[PDB]
Design a protein around this ligand. Structure first.
Ligand SMILES: O=C(c1ccc(C(F)(F)F)cc1)N1C[C@@H]2C[C@H](C1)c1cccc(=O)n1C2
Ligand SMILES: Nc1ccc2c(NC3CC3)nc(-c3ccccc3)nc2c1
Length: 334
């Protein structure tokens, strides 16, 4: 066991190993301090989870967050440098601290951009996504605040960003489809890319109805091929009885932009998720010509998410989270 010290920041107390120094609060899932890690010499982000075991839903959330972070080993995805608790035993285990690399800023703070910069940033998102998706994980909440970028324009997909979330959400999610796939994240990338290129939120809906309306303006109302794949009786009604809208030509919409950028946007922002380009396919698109390397775009080890369907007691989730704290193997330093 390392030696811990206490202090107070923003009402919240913090009990961290002495290894981590100069804790400075940066924003409030939980609250984050920037710190200096004496062991590795790195600036780091230390995230104290807020009430990790307040309920079954929190406790499962906490377990889920730890499992996901421990699995992620890729340059474009947030990784775990360390995880610790001040607790001596399971009996007193109440607090979870997660340690990751401190990134300079989020893509929300980055505001338009040069086309060569958007190429590099969207390349990196897709590279991280190929990896996440290969493990059968779907991010579901991609948006500029969940994309951390450092001084060097190096980008990492984040867990959580600690602006409406609806703005980047795939329409099949909006409409509550149950069998949506990994391309929901591709939709979001499409929305993010569009915003980087024009400097404006692509679909700034005031609510879920307005959101779908704005999406449909650009992509058009469902065609015959998509219509016949819709299972829900009312969903089909709501769309067979909205004023039919043509798909817009994206060239008419993103005027100025690189035609390759426009073309990729066309492949990402397909209303029908069956037709939408995957992360692996997008990486091969000509737009990423100067970055694409099929030998340096790894996939992930398999990830066991069987726990997702399990209905457990709060103290069981807490116990399993505790095992995960204990079994953690720090990554080897450079
Ligand atoms: O499933 C995730 C999630 C969690 C962690 C990670 C990461 F970066 F660690 F791999 C990715 C996605 N998210 C979907 C939503 C909102 C966010 C992001 C989130 C963060 C942490 C736990 C969680 O249940 N959720 C539910
Ligand atoms: N193979 C597919 C492909 C796309 C789909 C989609 N997406 C459309 C943008 C709404 N929506 C729905 C659906 C089903 C029931 C209720 C609400 C939505 N199903 C889809 C099945």
């Amino acid at each position: 066991r390392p030696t811990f010290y206490r202090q107070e920041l923003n009402k919240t107390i913090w009990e961290v190993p002495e290894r981590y120094q100069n804790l400075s609060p940066v924003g409030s899932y939980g609250s984050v301090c920037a710190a200096f890690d004496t062991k590795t010499g790195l600036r780091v982000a230390v995230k104290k989870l807020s009430r990790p075991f307040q309920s079954i839903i929190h406790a499962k959330r906490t377990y889920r967050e730890l499992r996901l972070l421990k699995h992620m080993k890729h340059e474009n995805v947030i990784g775990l440098l360390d995880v610790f608790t001040p607790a001596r035993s399971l009996e007193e285990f109440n607090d979870v601290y997660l340690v990751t690399h401190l990134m300079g800023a989020d893509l929300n703070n980055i505001v338009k951009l040069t086309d060569d910069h958007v190429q590099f940033l969207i390349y990196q998102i897709l590279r991280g996504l190929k990896y996440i998706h290969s493990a059968d994980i779907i991010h579901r909440d991609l948006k500029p605040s969940n994309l951390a970028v450092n001084e060097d324009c190096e980008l990492k997909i984040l867990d959580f960003g600690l602006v409406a979330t609806r703005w980047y959400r795939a329409p099949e999610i909006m409409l509550n489809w149950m069998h949506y796939n990994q391309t929901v994240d591709i939709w979001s990338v499409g929305c993010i890319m569009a915003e980087l290129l024009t400097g404006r939120t692509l679909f700034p809906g005031t609510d879920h109805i307005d959101q779908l309306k704005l999406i449909l303006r650009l992509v058009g109302t469902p065609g015959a091929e998509l219509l016949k794949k819709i299972s829900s009786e009312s969903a089909r009604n709501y769309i067979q009885s909205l004023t039919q809208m043509p798909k817009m030509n994206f060239a008419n919409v993103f005027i100025g932009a690189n035609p390759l950028a426009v073309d990729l946007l066309e492949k990402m922002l397909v209303l029908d998720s069956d037709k939408r380009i995957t992360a692996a396919q997008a990486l091969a698109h000509a737009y990423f010509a100067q970055y694409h390397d099929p030998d340096d775009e790894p996939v992930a080890d398999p990830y066991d998410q069987s726990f997702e369907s399990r209905d457990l007691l709060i103290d069981e989730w807490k116990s399993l989270t505790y095992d995960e704290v204990i079994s953690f193997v720090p990554p080897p330093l450079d």
